[PDB]
Amino acid sequence: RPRPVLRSVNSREPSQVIFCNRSPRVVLPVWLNFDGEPQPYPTLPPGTGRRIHSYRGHLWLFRDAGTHDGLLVNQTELFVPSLNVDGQPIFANITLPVYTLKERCLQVVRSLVKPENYRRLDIVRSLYEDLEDHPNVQKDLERLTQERIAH
């Protein structure tokens, strides 16, 4: 209720991090600052890597740079740097998630028709709303927070 909890500490301890883009999308790396607000960072082309100077105990989420589609890193949602034990840089293998076929079909249609034509399509009622409900990071953080609260 006070501060959002999906956030990074100011641990001041450096950490070597490498983002690998094992996805066909243009990945957008995102760092949540010490207040929970997401900071975007330069995009990653598909199949490319990059060493990144982040810090021990930060948070990183990755999305499609154009569509904001959700992406998994190391098979999970968020990524946490840590100590570099004996040289070792930390790998953040960004991957696609196994989308639901519904959300996947919306992904394609959203990339063909553009907003004002979402309601120019002869489809069932509760689908224009799903088309207009684009993937949102700020709301997926609210969801990701609300999910684990019950645990």
Partner: peptide, 17 residues
């Protein structure tokens, strides 16, 4: 457990003392 499950839970306990 994922590395961010601990990142969340440690904040909740620290932030809301």
């Amino acid at each position: 457990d994922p590395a961010w499950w601990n990142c969340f839970s440690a904040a909740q306990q620290c932030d809301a003392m």
